[PDB]
Amino acid sequence: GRCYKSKPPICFPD
């Protein structure tokens, strides 16, 4: 569920 807040974001399964 971790998402790095760039545009677009980089999101991960946790």
Partner 1 sequence: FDCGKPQVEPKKCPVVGGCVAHPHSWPWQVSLRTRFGMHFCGGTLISPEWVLTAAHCLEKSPRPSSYKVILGAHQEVNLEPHVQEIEVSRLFLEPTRKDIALLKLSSPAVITDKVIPACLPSPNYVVADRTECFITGWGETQGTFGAGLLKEAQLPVIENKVCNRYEFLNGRVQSTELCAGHLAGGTDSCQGDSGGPLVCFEKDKYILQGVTSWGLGCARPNKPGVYVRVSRFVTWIEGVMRNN
Rounded distance between C-alpha atoms, residue 14 and residue 3, angstroms: 9
Which residues in this chain contact partner 1 in the complex, by CB under 8 A? 1-10, 14
Taking the complex as a whole, how short is the minimal distance between the CB of residue 12 and partner 1, in angstroms? 9
Please state the φ and ψ torsions of residue 10, each to the nearest 5 degrees.
-110, 115
Q: Which residues contact 8 (CB under 8 A, 6 or more apart)?
A: none
